[PDB]
Amino acid sequence: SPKRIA
Amino acid sequence: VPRGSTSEVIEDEKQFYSKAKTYWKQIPPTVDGMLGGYGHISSIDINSSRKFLQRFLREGPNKTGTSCALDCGAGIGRITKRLLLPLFREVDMVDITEDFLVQAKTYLGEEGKRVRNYFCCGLQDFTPEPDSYDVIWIQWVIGHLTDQHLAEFLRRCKGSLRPNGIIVIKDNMAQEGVILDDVDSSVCRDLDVVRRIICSAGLSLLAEERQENLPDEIYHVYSFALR
Ligand SMILES: Nc1ncnc2c1ncn2[C@@H]1O[C@H](CSCC[C@H](N)C(=O)O)[C@@H](O)[C@H]1O
C-alpha cells in the first residue's frame, strides 16, 4: 500500500 | 552504501512470500485496507491514473485497444471498479488473497459482471495468456516480488500483450536503494533499480510520471508505461 516513509 | 537488489535484503525467500500472504489474509477487504489506512487518497490516485492511461488511447498507429485489461495485485478491485471497467470491455483480476477476490464480487456490483477471470495466485506463479491484454495494470504490489521474480513476471506480461498493448506499473519508490518492510514483507526500490529491472525484462519506457497531491509523509509514487 501507500505508506509512511520508514 | 545503499542496497541495489532484493538479494541484499531478503533473508529467506520462502518466508518473504509466506509472511506477506499471512499479512494480507488479516487485512480488511476494504478500500482503506487496500490503501493501508490511506483510503481517502483513492480518488486522487484514480484521477491521475486515468489521465495517464488516456495518453495511450488516442487514435493513431499506436493506439492501445480497449477489449481487455489485467489488474495485477487487484485486491478487492478498487482500480478495476473505478478505472478499468469503465474503459475496457472485460477485465481479468489476479491476486494472492482469496478473501479479496470473494469481496470483489460484492464490491464491483453489476459492472463486475464484466470481470471475466478471477485468478487467485501469486504473480510469481502466474502466466497470463499470450496475446490477451491491451493493458496490464500493476499497482502497489511490485514490492512483494523478488527482483528475479519481478523481471520474470514482466517478461511473461510482455508475452501476453495484444498489438499496441502496454504494461503500467504504479508503485511506491524509495529515494535511494532497496528498503525492506518486515511487517508487510515487501520492499520499496529506488527509480534506478526499478528502471534496471524493466530493462532486464526486455521492456522500454513510454512515459514516467510522479503522482502529485499525496500526503507529504508517504513514499513517493510513480507511474511507468512500458512496452
Ligand atoms: N505475491 C503476490 N501476488 C499477487 N498479489 C499479491 C502478492 N502479494 C500481495 N498481493 C496483493 O497485493 C495487494 C496489495 S494492496 C493494493 C491493491 C490494489 N493494487 C489497489 O491499488 O487497490 C493485496 O490485494 C494483496 O493480496
Helix B191-200 vs helix B147-159: crossing angle, to nearest 10: 50
B61/chain A closest Cα distance in angstroms: 35
Rounded distance, CA B68 to CA B91, Å?
Answer: 5
Resolution in A, one decimal?
A: 1.8
* Residue to mutate, B15, B18, B24, B152, ligand 1, most ligand atoms under 8 Å from C-beta: B24
Beta-carbon contacts of B95 under 8 Å, excluding residues fewer than 6 positions away, are: B73, B74, B75, B101, B119, B120, B121
Rounded distance, CA B147 to CA B150, Å?
Answer: 5
Rounded distance, CA B101 to CA B103, Å?
Answer: 5
Beta-carbon contacts of B135 under 8 Å, excluding residues fewer than 6 positions away, are: B53, B56, B64, B69, B70, B84, B88, B165, B166, B167, B168
A6/chain B closest Cα distance in angstroms: 8
Which residues of B sit in the known binding site for S-adenosyl-L-methionine? Answer: 73, 78, 95-97, 123-124, 139
Method used for this model?
Answer: X-ray
* Residue to mutate, B18, B49, B91, B95, ligand 1, most ligand atoms under 8 Å from C-beta: B95
CATH architecture of B1-227: 3-Layer(aba) Sandwich (3.40)
Residue ranges of domains in chain B = 1-227
Q: Tell me the three cell numbers of residue B169.
A: 506499473
Beta-carbon contacts of B184 under 8 Å, excluding residues fewer than 6 positions away, are: A1, B20, B23, B24
